[PDB]
Symmetry: none
Subunit: 72 residues, 2 copies
């Protein structure tokens, strides 16, 4: 199912994410397509700045979700 991770100035990472998916797994799915390693990926979604080892369900990330990505 798709998520739209939006990297700052507009670079929108369309990712196919699993029903099983996890946040370091999603960082690996970004480290593909965008080439960005996990420290340099700081994600933001719904109230929360995100970490590394959590699920997508934890943060309430679902189908057609806009996440934001902060580089650094």
């Amino acid at each position: 199912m798709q998520i739209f991770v939006k990297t700052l100035t507009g670079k929108t990472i369309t990712l196919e994410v699993e029903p099983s998916d996890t946040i370091e797994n999603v960082k690996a799915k970004i480290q593909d397509k965008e080439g960005i390693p996990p420290d340099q990926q700081r994600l933001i979604f719904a109230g929360k700045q995100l970490e590394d080892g959590r699920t997508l369900s934890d943060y309430n990330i679902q189908k057609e979700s806009t996440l934001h990505l902060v580089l650094r």
Copy 2:
């Protein structure tokens, strides 16, 4: 070696720091001295916010260096 970790809000935290000091090690010495826990602190040198496990030697933060501490 003596550095001046200021806040923008008036305060100067005068610290004897190491050439081996990483930023969280300086943040731990700020936790000791002024009571502030680690990832509440953000260190600025000049106008750049710092990465974590890099040293004061890497950044060239030597003696008499004024750093600026903000909280977020």
